[PDB]
Ligand binder design. Structure first.
Ligand SMILES: Nc1ncnc2c1ncn2[C@@H]1O[C@H](COP(=O)(O)O)[C@@H](O)[C@H]1O
Length: 327
């Protein structure tokens, strides 16, 4: 919040507005409870009036994922209040995505011990009928505010829907997302440089032209001298040499998506993802690394300054190491 938020606004502003095409296949599931199927995303989480208790209709705890995710329904829309395992990574990552062109959900950090922090907590305590909000959030030093994203996670794609959703476009985006995860060593989402069975929960497809919107983005700097280094270089090399054919790695990741969705967007699809992945790498090579490092440091500064939130000291040099390899 504060400087950080401004920096976010700036980045967010630069993102290419997504399609104006609403894909009915991505519409959230119709179930105090919030009907995500018809709920509208609260417009500006930079401005939330915690003192106007009458604007609030209720709060629901998402029984999925972390556990600490709540949907707040005001009269102006719905936003999300969430407990985060690693808030610094998550938020810092959110920014990085937006910087790389990715449509992450707008996120804002609220310090528990601040005027707004206390105000918000008092508001939630007033509206919570579950008796679980305060006990889960009040404990935290910083709480996360998030933009409601209307869509569904990749896993939840049927097969009878996948065709109209997994267009060339979506695929390329997916490709890009992978590049990012590589840069930050995020093994959770889409494996490529990790034997993990991945996890498609961490990725949503917005109704807005099925645009890919990542979630629970995290960073884990495996620095100094590790396999990741050559591994990505290799993949890259092969990819560049003859991008006309589905590399071993993308074939693997293709399979995965093929599994959860039971839909094989064979070869043509894999190539698309490869394209997107490259497109991003290419972009990343053009980065004036001195400037970028500063951009990075600005975020870190803002993080530390607005909330005592220090991100790992190896984070930046790592993301930079990777970024250099794309050169
Ligand atoms: N911005 C968002 N909009 C809608 N659902 C979300 C959003 N962020 C996270 N979720 C979800 O809530 C579930 C659990 O979130 P998470 O604990 O962060 O994995 C996810 O599978 C999604 O349905």
């Amino acid at each position: 919040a504060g400087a950080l938020w401004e920096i976010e606004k700036e980045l967010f502003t630069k993102l290419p507005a997504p399609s104006s095409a609403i894909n009915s296949h991505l519409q959230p599931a119709k179930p105090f409870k919030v009907d995500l199927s018809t709920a509208v995303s609260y417009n500006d989480i930079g401005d939330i009036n915690w003192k106007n208790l009458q604007q609030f209709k209720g709060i629901e705890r998402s029984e999925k994922g972390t556990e600490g995710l709540f949907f707040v329904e005001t009269e102006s829309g719905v936003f999300i209040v969430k407990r985060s395992t690693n808030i610094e990574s998550e938020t810092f990552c959110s920014l990085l995505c937006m910087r790389l062109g990715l449509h992450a959900p707008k996120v804002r950090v609220v310090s528990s011990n601040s005027e707004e922090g206390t105000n918000m907590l008092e508001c939630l305590a007033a509206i919570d009928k579950s008796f679980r909000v305060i006990t889960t959030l009040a404990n935290q030093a910083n709480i996360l505010l998030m933009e409601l994203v209307r869509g569904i996670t990749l896993n939840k794609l049927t097969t009878t829907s996948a065709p109209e959703v997994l267009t060339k476009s979506t695929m390329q985006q997916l490709g890009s997302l992978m590049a990012l995860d590589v840069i930050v060593n995020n093994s959770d989402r889409l494996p490529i440089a990790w034997t993990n069975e991945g996890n498609l929960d961490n990725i949503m497809l917005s109704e807005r032209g099925a645009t890919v919107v990542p979630i629970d983005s995290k960073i884990i700097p495996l620095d100094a001298s590790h396999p990741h280094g050559e591994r990505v270089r290799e993949l890259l090399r092969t990819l560049i040499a003859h991008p006309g054919h589905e590399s071993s790695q993308f074939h693997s990741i293709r399979d995965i998506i093929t599994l959860y969705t039971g839909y094989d967007v064979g070869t043509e699809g894999s190539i698309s993802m490869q394209e997107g992945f490259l497109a991003t790498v290419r972009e990343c090579a053009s980065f004036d690394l001195d400037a970028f490092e500063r951009e990075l440091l600005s975020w870190q500064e803002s993080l530390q300054k607005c909330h005592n939130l220090s991100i790992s000291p190896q984070a930046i040099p790592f993301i930079l190491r990777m970024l250099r390899i794309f050169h």
